[PDB]
């Protein structure tokens, strides 16, 4: 078994739109936003331009292979795999994808899509030039899929990387999940709410 023949497996027999069901058991999605650089801020219009890595993760077991005397990890394209239909509820602009649309896939069926992203956002910008700083809410969750099909769970100090060279500096990021029930269907359209506390630099 070689790299090529592994991608042959995945590309040919895995199905971009067939959500990897294990009967009545959701797809365990582990999300995180790691915030890289805060660009444009407009206190007046409560508009932020931001850039972050939507560190996304899941378990698609069908892919899995026998890695014993073979490569443990390979890098697949997004176009040939299943992907969460995640969506920033309070989004202004489309996703501007920077890195190549590829995900890493381990032999055990683990999948690592973490793209770099530029996107604008309507959020609480009120209080930027303070010591407390503005606290900026970004809701994101699946658009179509609900809990028992997809479950989202947020899993460091989040300033060690965040650009040393932005007009702004990060104070504290708290990813706090939010389960919500609607009046028809089994359970609840799960969605993560990330809380970006930040402020303008000194200067």
């Amino acid at each position: 078994l070689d790299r090529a023949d592994i991608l042959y497996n995945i590309r040919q027999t895995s199905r971009p739109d067939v959500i990897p069901t294990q009967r009545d058991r959701p797809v365990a999605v582990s999300v995180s936003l790691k915030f890289i650089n805060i660009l444009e801020v407009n206190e007046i219009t409560n508009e932020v331009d931001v850039v972050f890595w939507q560190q996304t993760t899941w378990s698609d077991r069908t892919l899995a292979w026998n890695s014993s005397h073979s490569p443990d990890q390979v890098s697949v394209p997004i176009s040939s795999l299943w992907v969460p239909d995640l969506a920033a509820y309070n989004a202004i602009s489309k996703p501007e994808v920077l890195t190549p649309q590829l995900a890493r896939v381990v032999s055990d069926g683990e999948v690592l899509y973490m793209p770099s992203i530029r996107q604008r956002f309507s959020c609480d910008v009120s209080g930027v030039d303070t010591e407390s700083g503005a606290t900026c809410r970004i809701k994101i969750g699946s658009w179509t899929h609900h809990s028992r099909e997809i479950s989202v769970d947020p899993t460091s100090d989040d300033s060690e990387y965040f650009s040393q060279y932005s007009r702004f500096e990060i104070l504290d990021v708290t990813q706090k999940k939010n389960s919500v029930t609607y009046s028809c269907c089994p359970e609840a359209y799960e969605d993560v709410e990330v809380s970006l506390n930040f402020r303008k630099k000194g200067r």
Binding site: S147, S179, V180, T181, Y182, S183, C184, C185, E187, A188
Partner: protein, 68 residues
């Protein structure tokens, strides 16, 4: 009193939280998939926000899931 808690399907043990309650309200996500409902139990019947629609009761499991 045992009341159906959300977002769980199942019934749970409230030693006298004296009510099972059924909040129901229409949001934006609502004309398709319906009013939001948070079920649960509590000490007394809750305050009412305007337009919010309520249903209190006292039978062991008296507030279950509808379809509306």
């Amino acid at each position: 009193i045992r009341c159906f808690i959300t977002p769980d399907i199942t019934s749970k043990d409230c030693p006298n939280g004296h009510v099972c309650y059924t909040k129901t309200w229409c949001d934006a996500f609502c004309s398709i998939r319906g009013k939001r409902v948070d079920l649960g139990c509590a000490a007394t019947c809750p305050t009412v926000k305007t337009g919010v629609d309520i249903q209190c009761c006292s039978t062991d499991n008296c507030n279950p899931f509808p379809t509306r």
